[PDB]
Each structure stands twice: as structure tokens, then as C-alpha cells.
Amino acid sequence: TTALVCDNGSGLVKAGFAGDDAPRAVFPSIVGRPRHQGVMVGMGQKDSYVGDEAQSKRGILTLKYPIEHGIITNWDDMEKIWHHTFYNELRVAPEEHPTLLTEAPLNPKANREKMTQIMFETFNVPAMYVAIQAVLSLYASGRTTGIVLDSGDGVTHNVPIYEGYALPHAIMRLDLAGRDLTDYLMKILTERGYSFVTTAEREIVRDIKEKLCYVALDFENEMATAASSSSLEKSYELPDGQVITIGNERFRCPETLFQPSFIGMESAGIHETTYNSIMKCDIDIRKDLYANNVMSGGTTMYPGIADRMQKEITALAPSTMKIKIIAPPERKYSVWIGGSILASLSTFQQMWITKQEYDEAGPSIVHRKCF
């Protein structure tokens, strides 16, 4: 009846109904399991916990993320998350509504085929569609032209679109993502003696990162400043009441997005990737993409990231070029919002893969681009 929109990406699950201005179900893509003993199954015990349950009880659980780098690697756990979203968080049977799913570009074909098969079997979704997240992000901004940098937990990617036409030959993807920045911060923090090694401890570091990290406009000057000034230090109170101090780790962590070499990658920084996607585009496109760089995804939420990219692109770009970065307060939910918009359009109504079409065509139908 009303399409469900479900941006079930790496790290965080975001779902709600088409026409909503926000997801209704927002929770971690985590399936947790008891760590210290077996499960006393003759008692009212559980074998696994999902999302918020997994976080509240994390002190006794091993926590796994079924999606790594945008790819579902653990299908049994992924079914548990989808089940939880439909029955515990949104509380809507899948048989009642068509579902719009999202995916990062350049993923294995099998990822879509298996995801489609599940939505058409364990759940029985009347019809479905898998959209590219960057495309949806541009719909959310309202622009028809620009280069969407969708930077999430598992994948960072760039998809240029010109006046509504996709430019598929200039799509770029990096593995560097929020998950790595978090892993890097766990490493950086050992320098001050704070050792976070368990999975629950990883979640604490994720929370530290979200509250304290920022992008330095000038990395070297910020380092020099941190070296002598206590003004860049902030405290954080841990779940058990202990207090720790975070100093230059606050900007050394997100700096890796500009300098991937900090964690051993050959990858270009996010401003170089954006620039290169622009340079692979036709010369008569480039000026419009320079003026329309659209950021979305959770890692774009670091304070100052939009200004740091404005500076870095301007440095690489011609001096007479207009450089503009669009970075709304809604970025974290931009892909979901774009999904809500797309699902409600009258043209998107005719491009749903229906159950009947799926049964006759088989899994390859998921790669249909008839639009």
C-alpha cells in the first residue's frame, strides 16, 4: 500500500514509510550473542539480541555487524535484523507493502540477488526495488546536478549526475569508511593508555568519536596547537563513571579521510577522489559539478568537514571556478529521505520488481535498469 523505505546499510539501520520526513525505526545493524557462558535454555534466556537490545546488554555480548564494506557477509544475522525491523520496530508485515532497498554501487551481483530472494521468500514483499544510495541522496537535496559523496560506516562513494543523467563511468568507491576511523581511534587511544579491545569497548570508542571528533581546517597547525594547549582537550565519562581525556586524537581520527595513508591505504583522500571523479567527467560538465558537491552519510557529520573539503577542492580546482559544498543538517538521513521521495513518485511506481516478474524472470531481474 505505502512503500516501506529501508536503508539497511553498514552500521545503522534506517527504516520508515514513504511519505514520512524521517525513519521511524533507527537502530544499529547488530546481532549480539552471550559471551561468557552457554545459554541456559531451560530458563527464560535468549540466544541473541538485536539492535538496541544488543547495545543495552552489550556488557555480556559479542557483537557482530552482518554488513562489512556494504556487503552482507552474514546472511543469517541479516535475516534477523530485517525480521526485527519489520516485526519489532515498525511492526508491519512485509506482505502489506512494497519495499525500497538501497545499496552501495560496485557491489557483487550476488549481494542483490540474495537480498532480493530473501525479501521474496522469508518475507513476501509484493514488490521491491534496489536503489543506489548516492542517487537517493541527490534526490533528497532537490538538485538534479552534482556529485554525491556518500560516506557511511562501510563504504565511501562518489556518484556524479548531470541534469538528471547518471554518469556511470565516473563512479568511485573507497573502502575507507567510518568503521575504519573508529578502528583507528581505538589504536590511537592506546597512546594515552586507554585500551579498548573488546567489541563492547569498540562501541564506546564509536560514541567517543561521535561526540568529540572534528576535522581540523589546518591539520598541521591544529597539531602544533594541541602540542602546547589544553584548550583542545575534552573529557569523556565512561559507562562505569571513570573519566578519560581525549586530546589531539579528536582530529587525528577524521584526518584519515583526507590522509588514508594513516591506516596504510593507497587511497586518495576524499577531496582527491571527488576531484578525480570531476576530472573524469566531460569538460562541459565539470563546472556544474564543482558548484554542486553534495555530502551525505554519517561520516560527513564531523564538524568542519564541509569547510575542510571546500578548502581542499578549491586548492586543486582552477582559481576561477566556483566551488560549493552542500551539507544539510539532515545528511545522516539523506539517503533514507531520498528513498521516501523516490517511492512516492508516479514514475517510480512503474519500475518496481513485482513478485510475479521475479518468479518468472528469476534473480537476474534485480539488475534491470529500464527506469
Ligand X SMILES: Nc1ncnc2c1ncn2[C@@H]1O[C@H](COP(=O)(O)OP(=O)(O)O)[C@@H](O)[C@H]1O
Contacting positions for ligand X (CB under 6 A): 9-12, 152-154, 178-179, 182, 206, 209-210, 297-299, 301-302, 332
Q: Pick from ligand 9ZK, a second copy, Mg ion, none: which does 142 bind, CB < 5 to 8 A by kind?
A: none
Q: Do 308 and 340 contact (CB within 8 A), yes or no?
A: no
Rounded Cα distance between 315 and 317, Å, is 6
Distance CA 212, CA 189 (A): 13
| CA gap 99, 339 in Å, rounded | 10
Q: How many CA atoms lie within 13 A of 295 on its CB side?
A: 24
Closer residue to ligand 9ZK in complex, CB, 69/252: 69
Nine-digit cell string for 265: 591505504
152 binds Mg ion (CB under 5 A): yes
Kindly state the cell numbers that stand for 86. Answer: 519489520
Nearer to ligand 9ZK, 351 or 365 (CB): 365
Per CB under 5 A, does 105 bind Mg ion?
no
Residue 249: which H helix or E strand, with range? helix 249-252
Length of the chain: 371
172-201 positions binding ligand 9ZK, by CB under 6 A: 175, 190, 193-197, 201
Contact with ligand 9ZK (CB under 6 A): which of 235, 242, 319, 347? 242
Specify the residue, 89 or 222, whose C-beta has the smaller distance to Mg ion: 89
| 106 interacts with ligand 9ZK by CB under 6 A | yes
Range 127-166, binding ligand 9ZK (CB under 6 A): none
- In the complex with a second copy, which residue's Cβ is closer, 217 or 263? 263
Rounded Cα gap, residues 139 and 133, in angstroms:
10
Choose the contact partner of 217 out of a second copy, Mg ion, ligand 9ZK, none; CB within 5 to 8 A by kind. Answer: none
* Dihedral sign from CA coordinates of 337, 338, 341, 342: negative
Residues that bind ligand 9ZK (CB under 6 A): 69, 71, 106-108, 110-111, 175, 190, 193-197, 201, 204, 238, 242, 244, 283
